[PDB]
Amino acid sequence: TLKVIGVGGGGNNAVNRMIDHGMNNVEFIAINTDGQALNLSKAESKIQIGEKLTRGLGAGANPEIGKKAAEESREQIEDAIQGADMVFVTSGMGGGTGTGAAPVVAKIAKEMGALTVGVVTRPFSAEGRKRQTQAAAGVEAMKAAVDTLIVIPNDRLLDIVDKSTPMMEAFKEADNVLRQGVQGISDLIAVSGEVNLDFADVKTIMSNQGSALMGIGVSSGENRAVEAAKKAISSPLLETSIVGAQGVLMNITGGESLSLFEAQEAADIVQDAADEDVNMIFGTVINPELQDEIVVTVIATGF
Amino acid sequence: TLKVIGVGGGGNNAVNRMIDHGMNNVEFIAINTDGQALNLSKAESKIQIGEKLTRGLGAGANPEIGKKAAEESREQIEDAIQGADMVFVTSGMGGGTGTGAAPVVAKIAKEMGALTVGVVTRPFSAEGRKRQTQAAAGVEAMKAAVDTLIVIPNDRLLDIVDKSTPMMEAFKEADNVLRQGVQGISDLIAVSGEVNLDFADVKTIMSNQGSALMGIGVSSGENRAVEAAKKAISSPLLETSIVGAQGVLMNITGGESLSLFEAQEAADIVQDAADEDVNMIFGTVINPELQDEIVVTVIATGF
Numbered sequence A, B: 001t002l003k004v005i006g007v008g009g010g011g012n013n014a015v016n017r018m019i020d021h022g023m024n025n026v027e028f029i030a031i032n033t034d035g036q037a038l039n040l041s042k043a044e045s046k047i048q049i050g051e052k053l054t055r056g057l058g059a060g061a062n063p064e065i066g067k068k069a070a071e072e073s074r075e076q077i078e079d080a081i082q083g084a085d086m087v088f089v090t091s092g093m094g095g096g097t098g099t100g101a102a103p104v105v106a107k108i109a110k111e112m113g114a115l116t117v118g119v120v121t122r123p124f125s126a127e128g129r130k131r132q133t134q135a136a137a138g139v140e141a142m143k144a145a146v147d148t149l150i151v152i153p154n155d156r157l158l159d160i161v162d163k164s165t166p167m168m169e170a171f172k173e174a175d176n177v178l179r180q181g182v183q184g185i186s187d188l189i190a191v192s193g194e195v196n197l198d199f200a201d202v203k204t205i206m207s208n209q210g211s212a213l214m215g216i217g218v219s220s221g222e223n224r225a226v227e228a229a230k231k232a233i234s235s236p237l238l239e240t241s242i243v244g245a246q247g248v249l250m251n252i253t254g255g256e257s258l259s260l261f262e263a264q265e266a267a268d269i270v271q272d273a274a275d276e277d278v279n280m281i282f283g284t285v286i287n288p289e290l291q292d293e294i295v296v297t298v299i300a301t302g303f
């Protein structure tokens, strides 16, 4: 009676999240151009489009490919729609597959008679200008091919999460913040007994200082070192009041691939942000359970 | 070498979170007045204080009890400190146990020679005026008994989570938002086949409307009905632009205890917020996996 079709990479991930969470009496269909990513989809129906233009590879962030690739497979798409009274076209706008194919997939199911509802997201502004522009063009194309369209701008995703967070889960977040503050110091000073830092350095930093401020920044990807350091500096506690810090304690924790040059980089970032006479000591921790994300946590004292 | 002591209810929950997450080379101690809650603590060291004043019950949000209850057990507290070079006093300020005992526990370990570091949180402003005032008094007492004090105001917890959220986890949140939007409609209309709503009502609401806006609000506790409805109305998509909605679709999902009067209440809240000529239909879903929290999700159309 109801069919939900995830088109694109992020569209498939949302569908897989709809399945892992208990969802019944809905028929799932995964549409994508990445051959490998469709193998990861838990959806019953899987449709690969545009194999002649991509050879099983991704659409390559070009929405013009996504438009044609969906047109080349008009046959198979209509077959999966058959029998549906209402259809959900869930996609992430800004890419090449979802940005181009989702409007096509919508117009097919709409002209086939079903109630076509689009449920899409605008990308984060940090993803670049081109991805935002392509998304805007796709949302306009989506609006002209659906009965109703739901637009989720990722820039306002933080507040949607806040209103959808119960008070029980809120304290669980506060629990993890207290953990990150304590672990950020203990994993740096008392580190078993091969080679690490000592105590007298930490003593001078925190002995009878008084009020302290904390910042946490987690980042991954190419420029993960600069980004994680920037995120930690712009936390509400330290964005306006690290320049007066006379003592700084920094913990950088990363996966197996965490280079030592990457550690000095984030250290130099926090060091420059602090006072000129700052007394900064830092160290590095290798937690392999983190795949390739780093967690820069910094404590500031003095004032 | 390092000891972390969670004093109070929330203090124990943070310690248990420090243990479930892989944390090594630290000695955990749980201090509290709730006899049952200390049975739930995974900490190796457990200390119940003030059994004569509370008989194993909670301190009752009176910080004066927490001060004496920690003084009555000065003996056992000093025994757990012994051998520590640095001690962490993690507590939630605003209560009765943590607000009063944590300053005492800190001054004991500080005069015993260890490096005393306080890691506490201010309560949410939504928790009341008295709990904020008691926390402010306790933070002042904490500051006068520790070497350094870390203050986490829960009002700014949302931004700390944002900077500590990697881009991989950010899309996982967006995945769950798309799920909540689609599930909020499918669980309302096509509901198997005993007794529920029909299709022609949903057809008139969404046929050729165009742009739509979504709001999600999750709440639990005593006044959970009004709160969850208020949270959904003040989402970034609907807080400024539901008054012009000519059609509203509302899904209220709750646990086993979800009363039917509770459903009409939240419906009347959203109904009043919309336009006078609004065409609102709604329904109720019982998901027992939710213990006692409700999830009000609302779709708006028209404009």
Ligand SMILES: Nc1nc2c(ncn2[C@@H]2O[C@H](COP(=O)(O)OP(=O)(O)OP(=O)(O)O)[C@@H](O)[C@H]2O)c(=O)[nH]1
Residues within 6 Å of the ligand: A007, A008, A009, A010, A011, A013, A014, A033, A034, A058, A059, A060, A061, A062, A091, A092, A093, A094, A095, A096, A097, A098, A099, A121, A122, A123, A124, A127, A131, A154, B171, B172, B174, B175, B178
């Ligand atoms: N909900 C959700 N959105 C995502 C996810 N990953 C990326 N996005 C968003 O979707 C936009 C486009 O990414 P994709 O959907 O993967 O692009 P695609 O069309 O599937 O991939 P290409 O065929 O190479 O163009 C990005 O700008 C992100 O904002 C995800 O895992 N979940």
Ligand SMILES: Nc1nc2c(ncn2[C@@H]2O[C@H](COP(=O)(O)OP(=O)(O)OP(=O)(O)O)[C@@H](O)[C@H]2O)c(=O)[nH]1
Residues within 6 Å of the ligand: A171, A172, A174, A175, A178, B007, B008, B009, B010, B011, B013, B014, B033, B034, B058, B059, B060, B061, B062, B091, B092, B093, B094, B095, B096, B097, B098, B099, B121, B122, B123, B124, B127, B131, B154
């Ligand atoms: N980190 C964290 N903080 C919490 C948690 N629960 C409550 N809090 C905060 O702690 C403050 C006081 O709550 P509790 O710590 O439970 O008070 P308590 O002293 O342990 O309990 P009483 O002995 O009855 O006074 C509240 O205002 C909350 O803001 C939690 O689970 N984790």
Ligand SMILES: [Mg+2]
Residues within 6 Å of the ligand: A008, A009, A010, A034, A037, A058
């Ligand atoms: Mg992809």
Ligand SMILES: [Mg+2]
Residues within 6 Å of the ligand: B008, B009, B010, B034, B037, B058
């Ligand atoms: Mg308690």
